[PDB]
Amino acid sequence: LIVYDDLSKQAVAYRQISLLLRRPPGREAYPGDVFYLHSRLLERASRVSEEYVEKFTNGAVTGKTGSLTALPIIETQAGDVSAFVP
């Protein structure tokens, strides 16, 4: 189980680096690929089949599935969900 206490603070740190590297800004000065920042992270949290675990461990573990559950946190301003990151 994994908790990301603030993905909105990770997005603000990524926006800083991107603006200092002079990459062109988007919808709220945020980088164009701010969606891919979070989608690349969150698609790893998953449940894998017995065949995947058996292949990864070279047969050392068998008949068992593996998993990673995620609990990301996001902060809104006065309930506004229309912001780009939320």
């Binding site: 002079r22 990459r23 062109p24 800004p25 988007g26 919808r27 709220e28 000065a29």
Partner: peptide
Amino acid sequence: SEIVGGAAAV
């Protein structure tokens, strides 16, 4: 402000 800011970078 966002359109002028984005076109100054491109």
